[PDB]
DNA sequence: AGAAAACCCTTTATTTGTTATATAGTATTTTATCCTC
DNA sequence: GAGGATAAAATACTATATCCTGGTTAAAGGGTTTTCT
RNA sequence: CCAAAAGAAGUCUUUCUUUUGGUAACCAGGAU
């Protein structure tokens, strides 16, 4: 393929890479263990650096200075040997160290699980003791040569043993003799017991060490003998004498080496084809410890099998070294330089390597040549994995070295840190500030920030205006800021989009794209109505600006992510430009009715006419503008250019409506009039008070009805209105405005009694400590309901802090009761409420007690927040990751499976109750069948969008349930179609064909996390949602029946014993070991005896495990377990997400199927492979004879599906990038390139959006007509 | 020709030995003990 | 009583949001070399 | 892509030619 490489890539594979690859990489040979030489400046030579191996490091200078000039080029000086040539070529060219003994990789050694020890069937305990120099291994044996010398040789040792034996014995009859002749001395002369026991002792005690040594000799020639005739290949010999004597008496019949070329001969003599046979069978009889370990063993086997590629690449006989220039060392000034710290460890290869070589060709005893080849094998196992055996080779201060293999791992790696995310040009940051005048597309930007992105832009346009000679004149002009350059900048910047961004970026939103316009200052001035996109606050945030520069990038920022063309949250499809807190306060003040304000309507009294009635509203606002009249007293009016509300324009003007002109009478407010005003022309005229539902309403049916210039010219004009009538709507905050319920002493002394009398009944003995708790804490709790109520009740309409809270602008009313009535009870550091309660308010001041029982929970709020800010980025990571290859594909697969909707379940007495939560499991889908209810025409047709209408609709004509089109059900191949995903969240039309709907999933479930508390053993929050999306075993298990009957319980003691009986009678299933601390649970009743259960009823209250109801109830009943189960979460946390993103989730979740009958296919039993896969091979195989792999569908994580990816660059730069290179190098896999990420590690156009061959290959051309006109 | 003050190299050794604030999850080797023949 | 098979425990590896700035970058010992007297 | 020196033309100060010269890792502290 390529070399160089010009972008023509088809594929990328990874493999071993044998000694003859990395010597032919090589241009030459590092043997000496030299930098720079420290005088001159220059690179030594045959050293980490020499010029002749690696490239000159002058363009077009040899080392010797013979060539100079650029004309002598690709030719190698005669006198140095440098190639003359440019001196980019550093970065490219690699050597290689050529090793004096064989060294093992240890990335096949050590990595769990030992892949030498599976591929060899050796333990990695006693395999670090071979490759280590710790023990000999047995290479080789003869076998036969063994059985015909062995018969002899068992002769030569029983004469060998006999003689021996035979000598021993002779000694002990002297000794015998030697024991007479003491007996003769004895009896002889006189002397007693003395001397006879003396020389008795003597004599005994000699007898029996000749036996010792007799009986310690035959042990050894046995232990020779016995080794010697058992012996077998790969069997370790430790206790050196032991091979020693081995070698010397049978050094035939058999080879034994030591170190990495042990483990070498072993692998020449392996041949791969009898143990992969010997594997399957074991598979297919064996069963147990001995089958669990075939079926790991042949995964490595069969991949050296399969492969053309050699197992040998595991042991090495050269070094590759990596290029100078990504190895650098630089001069710091003073004389000092700052190595790489690779040179280090390239160095002590080198320096070992060298010693064991001039050790070997000088003659050494065998001790030290395997001391120093041990100590050469060290070394490369710290050169390319430092610290993963043993302790880490060290620099100054004590610090590890970076090893080659740390370039690549954690978040500082290769990958993540430079290949997924850079650093970019034309970029700026600063601190944002409120622009309130900006529009809703516009932003401000200091003008020196503009000056120098737009630099290039500035420097053309004053030499094109004749204000500069060249470019450079130009450029000093743009630095030195002369006054012509800010008229050229306000015309280069007109209509040139800029990318504006906040981190963390949790959504799609986090991105948007204005219009600069220059500004006094240094901060960035940001439109108020984008706030809640980028989740952005004023007390300190900063934003990052980018600036497009071709025609692509300056369309994509104008169609596709300018700031007024997004209004609407791609999660739920709710308006994300809506006026706020300010804004809802003026435009709630603004549209308020006061009943007997100024100048308000007076019906006739019989001496006058009527009072308060205008001709126009240009009349009504001259009399506001003399104090005659209130924005807020109620009026009637003369309106000719608003359109009327619907009854009235039916009840007056009939025909076809009012027609801009016609004047009707309305009674209304004048400040109702302003509002309505600010809407479009043809809306309706409304007539109500804006809370902030109200306009969210208006908002909604405008952004339906309208197209997106309206509204957001709409939602400009209310953020006017609404800033200018908060700025008069008299909104302070006083002390005097806090006022006090009036009777709180009579309600706390009312239950302070209570109280009293609960702890009088305790201190009596009538209940437990818990008891008591358990009262006081609902006493406390009715005290505080109380003191709210009254609090509640006393405050008037219009107190700015009830106004604010009942304008829906901000706040709760708890924290109205908590500043003005009453705290109430807190919680302990556990979590329970303390008793006392906290009974000051903020207003009164709490005393010294009452503020250290409050902190007590404070800290443990924030510290939540502080902990959970970080697991949901990494939710969102792997939620991003797993689902990176969906995308809207085909317009419609045309097929007819479906799920079915709740919709509106059928009330018990008979009515349509709606079901709440409708708009996220029944909106946007698109019907797989008809709707037909009670034998009426088919009410809804298949194939329709399914918008409000038409739930109205077919909820008149009476049906509850209605199959539609999922992503679950998709048959497409790749991706997902558009009709099965339906409606567009954002955009509110249908998806389009080159969407990327996952990525917009996880977005949009892992974005609202930080908004999702932690709640007080069932988990209930982000670690719940953790536990659902990688499909672990919940924390509180709750089994769930199998089969339907009814149940016999036994209330055993320290735990409960359920037993299911079943109604076909077959067998009983049992459930043991249930905990008395858990619950029974509850449907429609407490589980009783005797009670009927259904075939997926759950008995226990908690969570039941998703992987046995996909083993019980299949895989529909699994991904509806698991969809309500994430909503649920999320709608107790009060977030919309619509379903189908947690399906795209849940569909990316059931992709595979395990395998339990191999058959014929070439699918090893307990691996997981992809259902298409299984589906294709199957057929094939059904012909050529008939014998089908039998399949399971299985669940998998987000985890461990999506590092089960067909590409292992998009795996390696996930997570385990050691573990993903070395298996995917094992098995030589190649990689396609045909995801998103792949191809921006690549720098490649993505396949999705603009980038897919339907619209990158559009042609453009003039109409002929136009050509025509010119 | 000998003595003193400034270079060049090595290496943080790895014992029959100088190293104790995480948890949560999974996966793979021991290992200990129990059950069977 | 011996062997095997299954729980148990014990180690081994992996992951934990984004952005910015400021201070440091080897010591210690042995052998040797060169200059001065 | 920039600096310095020399030569030529004009302007009273730009253009042409020749030569030379041209970073990271750790630890720590903050912010949203
Ligand atoms: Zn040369
Ligand atoms: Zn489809």
């Given at each position: 393929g390529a070399m160089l490489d010009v972008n023509f890539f088809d594929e990328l594979r990874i493999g071993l890479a044998t000694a003859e690859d990395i010597r032919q990489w090589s241009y030459g040979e590092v043997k000496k263990p030299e930098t720079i030489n420290y005088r001159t400046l220059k690179p030594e030579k045959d050293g980490l650096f020499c010029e002749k191996i690696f490239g000159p490091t002058r363009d077009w200078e040899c080392y010797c200075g013979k060539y100079k000039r650029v004309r002598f080029k690709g030719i190698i000086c005669e006198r140095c040997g440098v190639e003359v040539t440019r001196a980019k070529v550093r970065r490219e060219r690699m050597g290689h160290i050529e090793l004096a003994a064989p060294v093992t990789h240890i990335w096949y050694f050590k990595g769990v699980p030992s892949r030498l020890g599976y591929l060899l069937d050796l333990a990695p305990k006693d395999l670090e003791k071979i490759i280590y120099f710790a023990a000999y291994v047995i290479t080789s044996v003869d076998e036969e040569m063994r059985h015909n010398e062995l018969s002899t040789l068992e002769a030569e040792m029983a004469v060998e043993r006999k003689a021996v034996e035979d000598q021993r014995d002779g000694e002990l009859e002297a000794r015998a003799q030697k024991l007479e002749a003491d007996l003769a001395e004895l009896?002889?002369?006189?002397?007693?017991?003395?001397?006879?026991?003396?020389?008795?002792?003597?004599?005994?005690?000699?007898?029996?060490?000749?036996?010792?040594?007799?009986?310690?000799?035959?042990?050894?020639?046995?232990?020779?003998?016995?080794?010697?005739?058992?012996?077998?290949?790969?069997?370790?010999?430790?206790?050196?004498?032991?091979?020693?004597?081995?070698?010397?008496?049978?050094?035939?019949?058999?080879?034994?080496?030591?170190?990495?070329?042990?483990?070498?001969?072993?692998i020449e003599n392996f041949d791969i084809d009898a143990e992969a046979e010997s594997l399957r069978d074991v598979i297919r009889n064996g069963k147990g410890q001995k089958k669990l370990r075939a079926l790991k063993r042949l995964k490595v086997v069969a991949a050296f099998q399969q492969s053309g590629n050699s197992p040998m690449g595991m042991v090495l006989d050269a070094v590759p070294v990596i290029p100078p220039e990504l190895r650098p060392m630089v001069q710091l000034d003073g004389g000092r330089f700052a190595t790489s710290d690779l040179n280090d460890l390239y160095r002590r290869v080198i320096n070992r390597n060298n010693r064991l070589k001039r050790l070997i060709?000088?003659?050494?005893?065998?001790?030290?040549?395997?001391?120093?080849?041990?100590?050469?094998?060290?070394?490369?196992?710290?050169?390319?994995?430092?610290?993963?055996?043993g302790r880490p080779v060290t620099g100054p201060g004590n610090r590890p070295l970076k090893s080659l293999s740390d370039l690549l791992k954690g978040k500082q790696g290769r990958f993540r840190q430079n290949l997924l995310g850079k650093r970019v040009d034309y970029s700026g940051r600063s601190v944002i500030v409120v622009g309130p005048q900006l529009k809703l597309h516009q932003c401000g930007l200091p003008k020196l920030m503009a000056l120098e992105l737009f630099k290039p832009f500035v420097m053309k346009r004053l030499v094109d205006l004749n204000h500069a000679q060249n470019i450079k004149s130009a450029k000093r002009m743009v630095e030195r800021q002369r006054p012509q350059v800010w008229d050229v900048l306000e015309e280069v910047i007109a209509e040139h989009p800029v990318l504006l961004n906040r981190a963390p970026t949790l959504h799609r939103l986090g991105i948007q794209a204005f219009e600069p316009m220059l500004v006094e200052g240094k901060a960035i001035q940001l439109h108020p109505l984008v706030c809640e996109a980028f989740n952005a606050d004023f007390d300190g945030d900063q934003m990052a600006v980018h600036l497009p520069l071709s025609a692509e990038a300056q369309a994509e920022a104008r169609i596709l992510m300018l700031s007024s063309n997004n209004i609407l949250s791609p999660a739920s499809g709710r308006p994300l430009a809506m006026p706020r807190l300010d804004m809802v306060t003026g435009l709630y003040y603004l549209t308020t009715e006061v009943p007997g304000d100024t100048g308000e309507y007076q019906p006739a009294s019989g001496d006058h006419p009527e009072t308060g009635v205008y001709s126009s509203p240009a009349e009504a606002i001259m009399a506001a503008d003399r104090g005659v009249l209130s924005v807020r007293a109620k009026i009637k009016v003369r309106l000719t250019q608003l359109r009327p509300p619907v009854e009235i324009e039916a009840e007056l003007f009939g025909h076809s409506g009012w027609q801009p002109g016609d004047a009707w009478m309305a009674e209304t407010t004048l400040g109702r009039v302003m509002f309505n005003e600010l809407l479009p022309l043809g809306y309706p005229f409304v007539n109500k008070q804006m809370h902030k539902k109200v306009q969210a309403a208006i908002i909604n049916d405008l952004a339906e009805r309208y197209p997106m210039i309206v509204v957001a010219q709409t939602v400009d004009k209310l953020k006017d209105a609404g800033f200018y009538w908060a700025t008069r709507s008299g909104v302070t905050v006083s002390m005097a405005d806090v006022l006090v319920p009036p009777r709180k002493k009579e309600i706390l002394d009312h239950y302070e009694e209570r109280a009293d009398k609960v702890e009088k009944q305790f201190q009596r003995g009538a209940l437990n400590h818990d008891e008591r708790n358990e009262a006081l804490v609902e006493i406390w709790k009715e005290a505080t309901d109380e003191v709210g109520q009254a609090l509640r009740e006393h405050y008037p309409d219009d107190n700015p802090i009830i106004t604010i809270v009942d304008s829906g602008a901000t706040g709760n009313f708890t924290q109205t009761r908590t500043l003005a009535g009453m705290k109430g009870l807190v919680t302990n550091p556990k979590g329970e409420f303390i008793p006392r309660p906290v009974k000051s308010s903020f207003r009164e001041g709490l005393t010294v007690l009452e503020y250290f029982i409050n902190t007590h929970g404070a800290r443990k709020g924030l510290a939540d927040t502080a902990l959970r800010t970080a697991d949901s980025g990494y939710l969102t990571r792997r939620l991003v990751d797993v689902s990176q290859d969906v995308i809207v594909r085909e317009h419609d697969c045309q097929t007819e499976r479906g799920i079915?909707?709740?919709?509106?379940?059928?009330?018990?007495?008979?009515?349509?109750?709606?079901?709440?939560?409708?708009?996220?499991?029944?909106?946007?889908?698109?019907?797989?069948?008809?709707?037909?209810?009670?034998?009426?025409?088919?009410?809804?047709?298949?194939?329709?969008?399914?918008?409000?209408?038409?739930?109205?609709?077919?909820?008149?004509?009476?049906?509850?349930?209605?199959?539609?089109?999922?992503?679950?059900?998709?048959?497409?191949?790749?991706?997902?179609?558009?009709?099965?995903?339906?409606?567009?969240?954002?955009?509110?039309?249908?998806?389009?064909?080159?969407?990327?709907?996952?990525?917009?999933?996880?977005?949009?479930?892992?974005?609202?996390?930080?908004?999702?508390?932690?709640?007080?053993?069932?988990?209930?929050?982000?670690?719940?949602?953790?536990?659902?999306?990688?499909?672990?075993?919940?924390?509180?298990?709750?089994?769930?029946?199998?089969?339907?009957?009814?149940?016999?319980?036994?209330?055993?003691?320290?735990?409960?014993?359920?037993?299911?009986?079943?109604?076909?009678?077959?067998?009983?299933?049992?459930?043991?070991?249930?905990?008395?601390?858990?619950?029974?649970?509850?449907?429609?009743?407490?589980?009783?005896?005797?009670?009927?259960?259904?075939?997926?009823?759950?008995?226990?209250?908690?969570?039941?495990?998703?992987?046995?109801?996909?083993?019980?109830?299949?895989?529909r009943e699994v991904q509806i377990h698991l969809v309500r189960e994430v909503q649920e979460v999320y709608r107790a946390q009060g977030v919309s997400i619509h379903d189908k993103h947690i399906e795209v989730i849940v569909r990316q979740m059931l992709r595979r199927v395990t395998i339990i009958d191999s058959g014929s296919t070439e699918f090893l039993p307990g691996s997981l492979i992809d259902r298409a896969e299984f589906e294709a091979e199957n057929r094939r195989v059904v012909a050529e004879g008939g014998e089908p792999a039998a399949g399971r569908p299985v669940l998998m994580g987000i985890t461990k599906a999506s590092l089960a990816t067909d590409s292992w660059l998009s795996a390696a730069s996930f997570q385990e990038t050691t573990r993903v290179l070395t298996d995917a190098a094992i098995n030589c896999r190649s990689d396609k390139l045909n995801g998103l990420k792949e191809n921006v590690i690549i720098g490649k156009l993505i396949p999705a959006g603009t980038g897919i061959n339907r619209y990158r290959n559009i042609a453009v051309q003039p109409t002929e007509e136009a050509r025509a006109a010119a």
């Open positions: 009896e002889a002369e006189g002397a007693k017991a003395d001397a006879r026991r003396k020389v008795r002792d003597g004599g005994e005690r000699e007898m029996r060490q000749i036996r010792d040594r007799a009986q310690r000799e035959l042990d050894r020639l046995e232990d020779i003998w016995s080794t010697f005739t058992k012996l077998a290949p790969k069997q370790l010999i430790v206790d050196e004498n032991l091979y020693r004597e081995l070698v010397d008496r049978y050094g035939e019949y058999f080879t034994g080496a030591m170190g990495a070329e042990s483990i070498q001969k072993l060709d000088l003659g050494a005893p065998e001790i030290i040549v395997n001391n120093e080849k041990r100590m050469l094998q060290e070394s490369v196992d710290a050169l390319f994995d430092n610290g993963r055996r079915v909707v709740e919709l509106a379940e059928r009330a018990p007495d008979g009515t349509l109750i709606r079901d709440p939560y409708i708009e996220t499991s029944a909106y946007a889908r698109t019907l797989g069948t008809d709707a037909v209810d009670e034998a009426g025409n088919v009410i809804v047709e298949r194939g329709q969008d399914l918008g409000d209408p038409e739930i109205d609709a077919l909820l008149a004509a009476g049906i509850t349930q209605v199959k539609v089109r999922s992503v679950l059900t998709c048959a497409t191949s790749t991706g997902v179609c558009a009709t099965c995903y339906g409606r567009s969240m954002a955009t509110g039309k249908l998806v389009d064909i080159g969407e990327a709907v996952g990525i917009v999933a996880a977005q949009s479930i892992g974005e609202p996390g930080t908004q999702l508390t932690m709640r007080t053993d069932i988990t209930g929050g982000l670690p719940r949602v953790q536990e659902l999306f990688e499909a672990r075993v919940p924390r509180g298990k709750a089994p769930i029946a199998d089969v339907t009957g009814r149940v016999r319980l036994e209330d055993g003691e320290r735990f409960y014993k359920i037993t299911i009986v079943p109604d076909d009678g077959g067998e009983e299933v049992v459930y043991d070991k249930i905990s008395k601390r858990q619950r029974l649970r509850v449907f429609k009743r407490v589980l009783s005896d005797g009670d009927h259960v259904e075939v997926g009823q759950q008995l226990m209250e908690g969570s039941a495990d998703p992987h046995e109801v996909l083993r019980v109830q299949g895989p």
